[PDB]
Structure 1
Amino acid sequence: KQYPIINFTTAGATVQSYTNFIRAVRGRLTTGADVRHEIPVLPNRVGLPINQRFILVELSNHAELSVTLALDVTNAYVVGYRAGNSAYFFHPDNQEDAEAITHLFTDVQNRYTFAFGGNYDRLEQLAGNLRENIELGNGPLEEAISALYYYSTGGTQLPTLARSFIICIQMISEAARFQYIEGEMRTRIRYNRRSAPDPSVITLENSWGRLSTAIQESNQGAFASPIQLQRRNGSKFSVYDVSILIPIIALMVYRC
């Protein structure tokens, strides 16, 4: 009847409540995951039945406004959202994905597909701000939830909507994909801090597909060619194998 729902509120959010939330999100993403090896592999999109394809993340704030994000279990990424009686989707990359999203929010009166995709390069263009200048934390997420809701009423302009997607995607999708990024959000919540992600976080986000490829194509957990990541200060270093990454990457897109 309905896809699995995970609830989170910014209202009185704690390190523990955020941890419980990301744990529950990874739980629903990995129901059909390959968990035989050191790092979970999300299910292959090829031949995945439609009734296993999505999970719903219902977000609430101090204002008790609620939006529901749809996440694709094959890549943990946001494909669209519902606010009241309206649903909004990123432009699908192909006809199969366009058909898949017709199964989301089947109830809603108003369905809209954005002209644009949900990739960071495009969202940063629409927001007029790079990830390095968009603060993350409980405050940004509370504001993002209100902005996503008030898009449905005409109260939110597209640049603020795009900025709000950048906040939600990093604090939910990227936190689910990477223990390192979950921990970055735990630190911000603990200290009631709002701060932009440093180069270590941004390079990790940028590298998710490349890391999923290198790990799954590895010779007994040794890479064909090394992958470059960044330290907090932006200095580059090489990763030659999966070993150092098991604590850092929680979920991988199917590769082969």
Structure 2
Amino acid sequence: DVSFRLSGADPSSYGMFIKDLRNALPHTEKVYNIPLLLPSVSGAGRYLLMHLFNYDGNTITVAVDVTNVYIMGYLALTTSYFFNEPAADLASQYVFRSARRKITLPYSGNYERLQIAAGKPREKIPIGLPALDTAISTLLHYDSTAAAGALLVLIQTTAEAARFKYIEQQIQERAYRDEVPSSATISLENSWSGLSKQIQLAQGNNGVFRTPTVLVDSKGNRVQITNVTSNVVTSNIQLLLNTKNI
């Protein structure tokens, strides 16, 4: 398991949590020095538990699929909540079995469905450590509309930060003040699967992407990533989705 406490949290303790999260994801291989997530894992070993504590010390446990860093569901007190999708339904066979009741959320876990449920795109939702504290608090008491927004925050400040150093840093910059994600942040989130794939395809293609990946940079400018010498590959991305899952 990995843990993070918002009480007394700072950029350093958050960085340690994101390091712990990355290190809890198994791999047998690196591709261009980036851990390659496994094609599959069987049984309960597929799911990592993140223990998150809000400022007042209340807690939820979030279940993460270790092959793709997707949040499957979470436990709040004696109630479990899972996304309305087959991967989460399967996860419900292995985690939070001792919950007194299980609620299936009225949406799947993808950004499009969560944004619909929440009533807004995540371009408009502030993220940061304060937003994470709020998210945890919201998820403690069932409200499916409020939960969608909280889950958008949760996913970005945990999974997306684990996947990209740039995103981890953006959240560190928002340790004490929330701010909507940069366009670059959104672009990276949207491109994780594409980049993971193209980095793997570059292995037998002299480090060259078969298909370029278009991103937005820090300065708001749209850029083409064509090969593994780009900073996105050498510095930023920290985990690759196995091409067998793409």
For the aligned pair, the TM-score class normalised by the smaller chain equals: over 0.9
Q: Give 1:208's aligned residue.
A: 192
Q: Give the partner amino acid of 2:225.
A: V
Q: Give 1:129's aligned residue.
A: 120
Change over 3 Å in CA distance of 1:129–1:33 after alignment to 2: farther
- Take 1:127 and 1:55, find their aligned partners in 2: how far apart are those partners? 26
3-state SS of paired residue (1:172):
helix
Q: TM-score, normalization: structure 2?
A: 0.93
Aligned residues: 240
Choose from 138, 146, 158 the match for 1:147.
138
Q: Give 1:154's aligned residue.
A: none
Q: Give 1:98's aligned residue.
A: 89
Greater Cα shift, 162-171 or 33-42: 33-42
3-state SS of paired residue (2:243):
coil
Choose from 12, 23, 29 the match for 2:19.
23
3-state SS of paired residue (1:217):
helix
Structure 1: gaps of 5 or more residues: 152-156
> Are residues 1:171 and 2:157 paired?
yes
* Deviation of 1:33 (Å): 4.4
Q: Give 1:220's aligned residue.
A: 206
Deviations 1:77-124 (A, max 9, x none): 111000011111112246xx6334310111111112224211111111
3-state SS of paired residue (1:215):
helix
- Take 2:62 and 2:54, find their aligned partners in 1: how far apart are those partners? 14
Residues 85 and 109 in structure 2, CA contact (< 8 A), matched pair in contact too = no
Change over 3 Å in CA distance of 1:33–1:133 after alignment to 2: farther
3-state SS of paired residue (1:102):
coil
Q: Give 1:81's aligned residue.
A: 74
- Take 2:234 and 2:160, find their aligned partners in 1: how far apart are those partners? 16
Q: Please tell me the root mean square deviation across aligned C-alpha atoms, in Å.
A: 1.5
3-state SS of paired residue (2:138):
helix
Runs of 4+ aligned residues of structure 1 deviating over 4 Å after TM superposition are: none
Q: Give the partner amino acid of 1:134.
A: I
- Take 1:107 and 1:178, find their aligned partners in 2: how far apart are those partners? 34
3-state SS of paired residue (2:35):
coil
Choose from 30, 35, 40 the match for 1:40.
35
> Are residues 1:249 and 2:237 paired?
yes
> Are residues 1:184 and 2:176 paired?
no
Residues 199 and 233 in structure 1, CA contact (< 8 A), matched pair in contact too = no
Residues 47 and 91 in structure 2, CA contact (< 8 A), matched pair in contact too = no
Q: TM-score, normalization: structure 1?
A: 0.89
Change over 3 Å in CA distance of 1:240–1:120 after alignment to 2: same
* Deviation of 1:252 (Å): 0.9
Residues 222 and 242 in structure 1, CA contact (< 8 A), matched pair in contact too = yes
Change over 3 Å in CA distance of 1:100–1:158 after alignment to 2: closer
Residues 27 and 35 in structure 2, CA contact (< 8 A), matched pair in contact too = no
* Deviation of 1:51 (Å): 3.2
Q: Give 1:237's aligned residue.
A: 223
Residues 83 and 89 in structure 2, CA contact (< 8 A), matched pair in contact too = no
Q: Pick the structure with more strand per residue.
A: 2
Q: Give the partner amino acid of 1:131.
A: R
Deviations 1:52-75 (A, max 9, x none): 201011111122210011000011
* Deviation of 1:224 (Å): 1.1
Q: Percent identity?
A: 34
Change over 3 Å in CA distance of 1:65–1:248 after alignment to 2: same
